[PDB]
UniProtKB/Swiss-Prot annotation, chain A:
Binding positions for substrate per the UniProt entry: E50, E126, Y127, A128, H129, N193
Induction of its expression: By allolactose.
Binding-site residues, Na(+): F190, N193
Organism: Escherichia coli (strain K12)
The protein's name in its UniProt record: Beta-galactosidase
Top-rank lineage group of the source organism: Bacteria
Amino acid sequence: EANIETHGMVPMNRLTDDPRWLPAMSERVTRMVQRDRNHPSVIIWSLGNESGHGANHDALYRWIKSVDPSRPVQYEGGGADTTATDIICPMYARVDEDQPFPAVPKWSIKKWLSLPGETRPLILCEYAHAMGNSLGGFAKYWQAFRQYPRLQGGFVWDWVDQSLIKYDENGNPWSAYGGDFGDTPNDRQFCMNGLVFADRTPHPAL
Amino acid sequence: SGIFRDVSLLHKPTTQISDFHVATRFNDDFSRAVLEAEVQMCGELRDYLRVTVSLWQGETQVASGTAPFGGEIIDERGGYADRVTLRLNVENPKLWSAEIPNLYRAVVELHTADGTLIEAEACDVGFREVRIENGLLLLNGKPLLIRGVNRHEHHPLHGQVMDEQTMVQDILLMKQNNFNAVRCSHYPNHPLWYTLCDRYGLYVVDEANIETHGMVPMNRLTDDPRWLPAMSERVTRMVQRDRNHPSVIIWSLGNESGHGANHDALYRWIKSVDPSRPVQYEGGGADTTATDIICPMYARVDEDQPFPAVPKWSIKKWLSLPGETRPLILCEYAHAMGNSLGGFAKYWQAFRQYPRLQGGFVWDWVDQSLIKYDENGNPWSAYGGDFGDTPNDRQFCMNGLVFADRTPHPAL
Ligand code: NA
Ligand code: NA
Ligand code: NA
Ligand code: NA
């Protein structure tokens, strides 16, 4: 995945729809493909994450398709099914329940496949948000993946808690999140979404 | 068996209207319509002969056209000298639908050039466009949601003889219980039925009288070209009879006859002769090349039924199978045998959530019970083998939302 996320912009595609930022975005995509295109484990290129959908995405999608046709390109931003992705790749679309947000709805993944004119496979780039005591309803996803041919799985969010170690005054280490370093404004425990702890000990969800 | 519909004498002149077709074409917002009436004559062609086609709404004549016989050039040999096609413009036509069944009256006059009437024929015209576009069945540009029921022609005292009073009672009860569509399971109905559906507002699936369900396999006759002439008359004579009715929105090739090459042939025949209506056919797995609509019977909402060559996928799953783009409308679902219709709300949740799930037709409208009489004279409702008839299938003829006297079951 290219090193491009402009999530804090308002709207999200404010830079990715601007041709002044097309040269900077183009180097994040093209230098990734030039570096990693011989690795067999890389099967899909991603244009980045949470940067809306802009014309720069469409351009860099087509660049990758011209330079390396051996790998699909995916990109979730701007509604998970834009012209910049070969795969319907939503984040946290539910199995049976629609979430009808105004310009970027998250249809239920069963419903999304049969929308008129939709033919791509669907692979969730993020699903089953493993924040703390979580992964409830995980079996519903895997029932749906096994039943529906174009539901070809997805990527759990995510592998490892992003906790950092701090030390108490007696020397004992402890796992720290968010604003435990004086860092403000922070987002507290939202960095810990892992199936495993930061020392790679498994959570029960694993 | 027997002579179970009307018998009539019709006197025509020797020079006569022998056929007429009414088509309606629209612009993209349906604000201008062209009525195209093709009229064919039989008998002596005279140069004085004329056809006038007039369009009437209530009492006001909206469009008229007068032309001698003579079609446009068709091929190297010419055109039909015994046909004439009139095109009438209608500005802002009142469109037909099941919600608002706006009807015009078309009159087709065969008359001489000095104005002497030879013979008139006529039909009700409903201006509507039925089309499948981007995987959805549209009526007048809007995606339909089919609230349908299958309806046999059954009367508990008269058997299979239909009368206007029972037809009107069925249509009223259907509309009063929020049905908008009826499937003619599984044959062309009495001719009055389509008139009443035109006037009251029901979408009709008009179905050829072809079911070979008892064959082994089911397509043993329908895949045999020796039976193609017999099947071809059941389809072509239905389309020639009923193609001017606006309530008929879909043609059906029949029911439960497998999938044979004769189905593919007759599908393509209808598509060539009448492109204004989709063709559907369930047999051979509900999604063959002989149907424009995925039209399974009793496919479940969420549960697959993976039968070996004719699986019934869950209707949500069926829509997204690779290469599948058609709308899905169950030709039969929610089998209303006795105390039934459990799980009916699951279907209607699925129909409302999924755009290409455009509804279906409940099996079925009326119990096929017949009345017998006990020794003291009291009537009672009889099924299956209550007439000494064997082999029989007992109470399986009673699958209705209403009793045979049209009293509602609780499922209605
Ligand atoms: Na799958
Ligand atoms: Na997070
Ligand atoms: Na629907
Ligand atoms: Na039955």
